[PDB]
Scaffold this motif. Structure first.
Motif, PDB file in Angstrom:
ATOM      1  N   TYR A  46       0.826  -1.197   0.000  1.00 49.75           N
ATOM      2  CA  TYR A  46       0.000   0.000   0.000  1.00 49.75           C
ATOM      3  C   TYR A  46       0.861   1.248   0.000  1.00 49.75           C
ATOM      4  O   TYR A  46       0.826   2.045  -0.942  1.00 49.75           O
ATOM      5  CB  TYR A  46      -0.929   0.005   1.206  1.00 49.75           C
ATOM      6  CG  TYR A  46      -1.884   1.163   1.190  1.00 49.75           C
ATOM      7  CD1 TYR A  46      -2.886   1.241   0.244  1.00 49.75           C
ATOM      8  CD2 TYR A  46      -1.775   2.184   2.108  1.00 49.75           C
ATOM      9  CE1 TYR A  46      -3.756   2.298   0.220  1.00 49.75           C
ATOM     10  CE2 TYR A  46      -2.641   3.246   2.091  1.00 49.75           C
ATOM     11  CZ  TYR A  46      -3.630   3.297   1.146  1.00 49.75           C
ATOM     12  OH  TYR A  46      -4.497   4.356   1.123  1.00 49.75           O
TER      13      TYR A  46
ATOM     14  N   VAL C  72      -6.030  -4.997  -2.721  1.00 47.93           N
ATOM     15  CA  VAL C  72      -5.709  -3.923  -1.793  1.00 47.93           C
ATOM     16  C   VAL C  72      -6.321  -4.280  -0.452  1.00 47.93           C
ATOM     17  O   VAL C  72      -7.439  -3.870  -0.125  1.00 47.93           O
ATOM     18  CB  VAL C  72      -6.189  -2.554  -2.302  1.00 47.93           C
ATOM     19  CG1 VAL C  72      -5.262  -2.065  -3.375  1.00 47.93           C
ATOM     20  CG2 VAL C  72      -7.591  -2.647  -2.850  1.00 47.93           C
ATOM     21  N   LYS C  74      -6.235  -3.755   3.381  1.00 47.68           N
ATOM     22  CA  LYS C  74      -5.778  -2.853   4.420  1.00 47.68           C
ATOM     23  C   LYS C  74      -5.908  -3.550   5.763  1.00 47.68           C
ATOM     24  O   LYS C  74      -6.959  -4.118   6.077  1.00 47.68           O
ATOM     25  CB  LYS C  74      -6.569  -1.544   4.407  1.00 47.68           C
ATOM     26  CG  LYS C  74      -6.215  -0.623   3.247  1.00 47.68           C
ATOM     27  CD  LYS C  74      -6.445   0.839   3.587  1.00 47.68           C
ATOM     28  CE  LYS C  74      -5.553   1.293   4.731  1.00 47.68           C
ATOM     29  NZ  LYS C  74      -4.127   1.400   4.336  1.00 47.68           N
TER      30      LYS C  74
END
Ligand SMILES: [Mg+2]
Ligand SMILES: [Mg+2]
Ligand SMILES: [Mg+2]
Ligand SMILES: [Mg+2]
Ligand SMILES: [Mg+2]
Ligand SMILES: [Mg+2]
Ligand SMILES: [Mg+2]
Ligand SMILES: [Mg+2]
Ligand SMILES: [Mg+2]
Ligand SMILES: [Mg+2]
Ligand SMILES: [Mg+2]
Ligand SMILES: [Mg+2]
Ligand SMILES: [Mg+2]
Lengths: 117, 59, 101, 150, 137, 112
Positions: A46, C72, C74
RNA sequence: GGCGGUAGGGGAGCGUUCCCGAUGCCGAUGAAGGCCGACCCGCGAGGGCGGCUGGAGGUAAGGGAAGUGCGAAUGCCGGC
RNA sequence: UGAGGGCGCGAGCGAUAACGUCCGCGUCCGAGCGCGGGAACAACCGAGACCGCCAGCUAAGGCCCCCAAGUCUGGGCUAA
RNA sequence: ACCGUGAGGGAAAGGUGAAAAGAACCCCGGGAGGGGAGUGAAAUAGAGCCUGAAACCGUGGGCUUACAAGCAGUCACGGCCCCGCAAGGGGUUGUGGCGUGCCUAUUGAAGCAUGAGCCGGCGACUCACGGUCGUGGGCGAGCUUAAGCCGUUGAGGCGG
């Protein structure tokens, strides 16, 4: 109506192995280890996908700075003229024309020494 | 249950890199003066004998 | 001949004769779009103004879709916050024709 | 069946802490929140099934999938003494059928019919009605079904 | 995408250090190693140029550092912190008066002791005439 | 063609014979034997009754000649193990792993 | 226009076991399960597809009931 | 949820000590140990992160080298 | 079985194949265990013989490593080997950028606070009755049954 575990709990541990491929030692075959180092990756990936520009954002400048100082002027003094020329073009990458034909860029330099001196 | 103690389970390379110094030197040998046999240096072969010290076996 | 071009929030250095990925545009996937937004020229054509004076570059589309879905996920440490997510980033299999004007 | 005795003291033990072996955390001991036997029935208001009885009957009428009967070549006991009755009435094994009659003979004549389930004149279970794709009944029914509602 | 070359031919450089202020001189040297004077700069492949700085015992530095600044070397034993001054080295090892300054400006990874290889600082002068001697001033 | 023979179930720990097998590997059979017959160990005996038995069935069943072949590949795996207890001290009872083996030897052809 | 987020609140979904759907259908031209994959759908938990193994059961769309989803408890059993 | 904590400030205690405590306002960490400067440094400074892009403007802070950016211009100051 | 003098505690362990038709015989070998031939649809069904995962051990092959400072990964580029059609893709990593494992309690972590060697399975808000709110459906100055009684046997109706 009993519903033992069975298929469910295994297939998941196989997916973590599926993404833990090439991870040192237990970090790719031991499950609840592979679970971990995946957490950091998706975080490490990220931040760095946010970072990869700033990396190249920096690199381009040095190359640019390498060019302007080969005409005889600094990067700070280079950009201003371009900005004084109001040229929202120069994607700091596209100023890579120092090994992509130089007069195309060498004569971007003299169009800077105009509106300042 | 006692005194010093390993702290972390010694890893695989860890365990294995120690073990390079453990592979066996293969036995050195020469051929018998007379026999077509294979035999140690400075020895008497378990079939022949010699020429100044017997060994001579049997059928 | 240097063909710069600026579309979809990013610009590029094009030499005329191969394909490119750029973001979508409200278009039918089988046509040809004009970018009168052009910069420079391989025979040296600096642009005092940002956008050039009226020149152009002509490009042909092809289709749409996606390349790689890139996960993605998180995960905030400590605090039971894990997320699992991914997406596709569509684009335009873009083929550039000429730099005519 | 296991006893009720601590397995090993928790103080000074090395392992964890435990007790009797019925403990669900172990294995083979006790169930957690297992499913002890219990009824599933209740008391649904009659006014829901009464109206529920009617609703489904018209559903076959609304589609025509109905028939009241009174005449029978099969007023006696034989599965062959019926399928021809169905032939002369209009049931060619294409689609399913529920049957009602107060005669325990015709039931025999079709109790072995895979596509025809028996039904006494009383328990018009809305299940089997909606189950079968077509319906049949008699006057011996259409006096109690009437005395229910009619 | 971005430009990166493939093969790279380096270039050597001749530099003197008579009167050249100590630190400001060796500063450009590091930049002159880490080829950021090359628009084809590469952040890993080590394109660094080869600087051959003849003469250095005649190097001067601002102030009284000749009798004030000391360098430190630590063996490992007690009493090992060897505090050597800028003067005693400028007498029998005037060659590492610059070295242990550039390494102080070269980066930290393994590429550093490659970049620092591409550079030798004799004090003579007239170094081993290898070939080209690009004297940049 | 390779020829094989396994001596399943052999009460000797693997870590021991792997030291031995890893010596005749790649060696010609003639030397392999002379290597073994003078190899002061214990696994060397067990190989012999599986080597010259793997070179045997390279003859008595797989029509090859012994005068030519070579140690193609040789490995050993780990079978189960009998469990025996070891009265240690103060009443502790720490079990023990008497390990068997699965010595495997295959042999090929020099030339021709 | 808003969308960092713990305790907590509401909404939405994926998976497992079983029942109606069934005297139904898929299955020897190979089911459930297990090895893979850089294919496809989904942001998701997941669902399809090609290959290998296995050898006999498995069950759609809409409803229903749960012993229902594991990373830890010096958790328990077994193996290493 | 009812143990909180940091910093700026106004007090009490304390020795006009305590990276000590009890209060009031506000701020932030806790829930923002996610980013940038402060070498490092939860609450000091900037700034609320829905995802993607090798695009541009900026705040703090910085522009000789690691370390991206003037050894910038003018005027003074200090030899430690 | 095992433990305990003793009351008493108290496990683990099923699966060849439809049929033993279960390996005659030959060979290595002391045997065990294997090679071959043969039965069998299948021996990759071999007698702890249906499926065979994971931890764990080893052999073979592609990439790398003996100037290098490391939560072991992420990002970029090149490099090696392989797949593939342009282009692309897989596996590895040399260099550069950044990078203080997980859960739990804690104001507070990277932590010198708890916990886990690893893997695989068992394992944690259901149920009964009453009641508040919400909602879906039935009737509507009414709404509704409980025990029980008739009947096929996974049918309901009466019963106020
Ligand atoms: Mg920028
Ligand atoms: Mg240039
Ligand atoms: Mg354009
Ligand atoms: Mg994506
Ligand atoms: Mg019991
Ligand atoms: Mg106790
Ligand atoms: Mg099942
Ligand atoms: Mg910082
Ligand atoms: Mg926003
Ligand atoms: Mg700089
Ligand atoms: Mg038990
Ligand atoms: Mg192309
Ligand atoms: Mg587990």
């Amino acid at each position: 109506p009993r519903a033992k575990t069975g298929v469910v709990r295994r297939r998941k541990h196989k997916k973590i192995l599926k993404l833990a491929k090439g991870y040192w030692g237990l970090r790719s075959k031991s499950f609840r280890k592979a679970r971990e180092t995946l957490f950091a990756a998706g975080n490490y990936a990220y931040a760095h996908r946010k970072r990869r520009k700033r990396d190249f954002r920096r690199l381009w400048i040095v190359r640019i700075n390498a060019a302007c100082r080969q005409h005889g002027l600094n990067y700070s003094t280079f950009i201003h003229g371009l900005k004084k020329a109001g040229i929202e073009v120069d994607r700091k990458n596209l100023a890579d024309l120092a090994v992509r034909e130089p007069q195309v860029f060498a004569e971007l330099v003299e169009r800077a020494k105009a509106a300042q001196g | 249950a006692k005194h010093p103690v390993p702290k972390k389970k010694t890893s695989k390379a860890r365990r294995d890199a120690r073990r390079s110094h453990h592979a066996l030197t293969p036995p050195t040998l020469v051929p018998c003066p007379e026999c077509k046999a294979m035999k140690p240096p400075h020895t008497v072969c378990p079939e022949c004998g010699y020429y100044a010290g017997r060994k001579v076996l049997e059928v | 001949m240097f063909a710069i071009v600026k579309t979809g929030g990013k610009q590029y250095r094009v030499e005329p004769g191969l394909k490119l990925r750029v973001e979508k545009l409200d278009a039918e996937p089988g046509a040809t779009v004009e970018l009168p937004v052009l910069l420079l020229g391989g025979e040296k054509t600096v642009v005092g103004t940002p956008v050039v004076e009226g020149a152009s570059v002509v490009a042909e589309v092809l289709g749409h879709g996606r390349g790689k879905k890139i996960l993605v996920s998180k995960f905030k440490a400590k605090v039971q916050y894990r997320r699992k997510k991914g997406h596709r980033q569509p684009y335009t299999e873009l083929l550039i024709k000429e730099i005519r004007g | 069946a296991y006893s009720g005795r601590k397995i090993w003291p928790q103080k000074h033990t090395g392992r964890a802490r435990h007790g009797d072996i019925g403990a669900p955390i172990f294995v083979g001991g006790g169930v957690v929140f297992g499913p002890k036997p219990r009824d599933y029935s209740y008391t649904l208001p009659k006014k829901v099934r009464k109206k529920g009885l009617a609703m489904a009957v018209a559903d076959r009428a609304r589609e025509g999938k109905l028939l009241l009967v009174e005449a029978f070549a099969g007023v006696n006991g034989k599965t062959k003494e019926f399928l021809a009755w169905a032939k002369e009435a209009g049931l060619d094994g294409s689609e399913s059928v529920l049957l009602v009659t107060g005669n325990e003979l015709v039931r025999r004549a079709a109790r072995n019919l895979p596509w025809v389930v028996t039904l006494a004149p009383e328990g018009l279970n809305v299940y089997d009605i909606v189950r079968t794709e077509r319906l049949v009944m008699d006057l011996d029914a259409w006096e109690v079904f009437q005395n229910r509602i009619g | 995408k971005t430009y990166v070359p493939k093969q790279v031919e380096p270039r050597w450089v001749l530099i003197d250090a008579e009167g050249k202020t100590l630190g400001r001189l060796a500063t450009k040297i590091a930049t002159l190693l880490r080829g950021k004077h090359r628009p084809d700069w590469t952040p890993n492949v080590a394109m660094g140029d080869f600087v051959v700085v003849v003469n250095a015992d005649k190097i001067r530095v601002t102030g009284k550092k000749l009798e004030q600044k000391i360098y430190t070397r630590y063996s490992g034993y007690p009493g090992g912190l060897k505090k050597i001054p800028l003067e005693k080295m400028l007498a029998t090892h005037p060659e590492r008066v610059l070295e242990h300054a550039v390494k102080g400006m070269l980066p930290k990874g393994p590429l550093g002791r490659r970049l620092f290889k591409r550079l030798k600082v004799y004090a003579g002068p007239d170094h081993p005439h290898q070939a080209q001697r690009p004297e940049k001033l | 063609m390779e020829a094989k023979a396994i001596a399943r179930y052999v009460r000797i720990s693997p870590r021991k014979v792997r030291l031995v097998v890893d010596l005749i590997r790649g060696k010609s059979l003639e030397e392999a034997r002379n290597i073994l017959r003078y190899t002061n160990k214990r696994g060397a005996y067990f190989v012999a009754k599986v080597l010259e038995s793997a070179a045997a069935n390279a003859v008595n069943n797989h029509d090859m000649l012994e005068d030519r072949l070579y140690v193609k590949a040789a490995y050993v795996d780990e079978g189960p193990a009998l469990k025996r207890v070891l009265p240690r001290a103060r009443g502790r009872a720490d079990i023990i792993k008497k390990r068997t083996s699965h010595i495997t030897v295959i042999l090929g052809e020099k030339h021709g």
